[PDB]
């Protein structure tokens, strides 16, 4: 009996569930709905110049922009460049020491642009990106689903 | 192999100081012939007194100093 209320606590939100379980179900929600606007570049391109080959998951633009949607819930006011530090890599240079590179803000611009067209992100009052009230409804309702194990 | 107890550490021996000269009491089963027998033997490794160790051939004694 793994799913039940613990004591008096009656609901869930983000940071009350697993981070991957939220992102995987949010990625699952986006393609099952179909209203997402996946760009044509996501077939050809690579997530950064620090990655050495293509993301090799056909749902990777769904898993990204669900991770990004979680990364607006935490840190409102985050821009494209603050997200590039979140998804950056340690790049393999050949015979030289490895240095950290921040990810291409291009795909992070498409990721926020898709989530605005859902209505889940608002462009912020003065800073970068803000979660709309529909997004708070979406992020928490989906996070209650993953504790009662309704992953779909 | 008989289990003997270190009752005395007689100082660091050898050239490089890695070997330790001890005085080991043999700790037999008290009805035995070789009970309460004490031997002066060389121990390799970190050894404090009251440290039990196993002995293959107990009839040898090391040359002291």
């Amino acid at each position: 009996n793994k799913i039940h209320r613990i004591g008096k606590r009656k609901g869930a939100s983000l940071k009350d569930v697993s981070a991957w379980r939220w992102i995987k179900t949010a990625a699952r929600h986006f393609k099952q709905e179909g209203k997402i606007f996946v760009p044509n570049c996501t077939e050809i391109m690579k997530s950064s110049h620090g990655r050495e080959r293509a993301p090799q998951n056909p749902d990777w633009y769904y898993i990204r922009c669900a991770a990004v949607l979680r990364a607006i819930y935490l840190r409102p006011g985050v821009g494209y460049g603050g997200l590039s530090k979140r998804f950056g890599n340690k790049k393999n240079y050949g015979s030289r020491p490895e240095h950290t590179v921040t990810s291409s803000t291009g795909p992070l611009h498409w990721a926020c642009k898709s989530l605005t067209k859902l209505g889940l992100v608002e462009p912020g009052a003065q800073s970068g990106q803000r979660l709309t009230r529909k997004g708070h409804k979406f992020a928490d309702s989906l996070a209650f689903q993953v504790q009662i194990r309704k992953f779909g | 192999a008989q289990v003997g107890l270190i009752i005395k550490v007689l100082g660091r021996t050898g050239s490089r100081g890695n070997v330790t000269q001890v005085r080991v009491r043999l700790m037999a089963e008290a009805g035995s012939p070789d009970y309460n027998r004490t031997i002066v033997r060389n121990v390799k490794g970190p050894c404090k007194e009251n440290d039990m160790l196993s002995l293959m051939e107990t009839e040898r004694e090391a040359r002291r100093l």
Partner: protein, 143 residues
């Protein structure tokens, strides 16, 4: 009609974890907002749990503990949190409870690991010139 609240701290290297222990209707211990069933490595969730486990689950019965940690990286934020919790129980029993109920559960912490309560004073030693680190020198070559 009252507020029973206690703030404690823990430090390991640079991780300073401030645990705000207060009385609530339900036990709810969460480190930076993560509810301690969800601290991700099962190894480091077990070091934060033995702040609760060596003393008993009964003593954290209706206590809401909020551990806010900053500094010092992944493993040092577990020893900062598990010390902020274990100090947090005891400073909740320095007030609000008598000395007989404490100082048994203080010594249950001290018998298990000395670093549930005091601190680990070890910091990084500075790099010096002529050395790659605190101690390792440049390579001498002779020929």
């Amino acid at each position: 009609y009252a507020l029973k609240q206690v703030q404690t701290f823990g430090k390991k290297k640079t991780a300073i974890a401030v645990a705000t222990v207060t009385k609530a209707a339900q036990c709810n211990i969460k480190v930076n907002g993560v509810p301690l069933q969800q601290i991700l490595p099962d190894t480091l969730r077990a070091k934060i749990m033995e702040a609760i486990t060596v003393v008993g689950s009964k003593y954290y019965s209706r206590l809401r503990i909020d551990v806010a940690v900053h500094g010092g990286g992944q493993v040092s934020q577990a020893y900062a949190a598990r010390q902020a919790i274990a100090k947090g129980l005891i400073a909740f029993f320095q007030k609000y409870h008598n000395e007989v109920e404490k100082a048994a559960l203080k010594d249950k912490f001290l018998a298990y690991d000395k670093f549930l309560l005091i601190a680990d004073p070890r910091r990084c030693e500075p790099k010096k010139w002529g050395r790659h680190s605190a101690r390792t020198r440049f390579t001498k070559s002779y020929r």
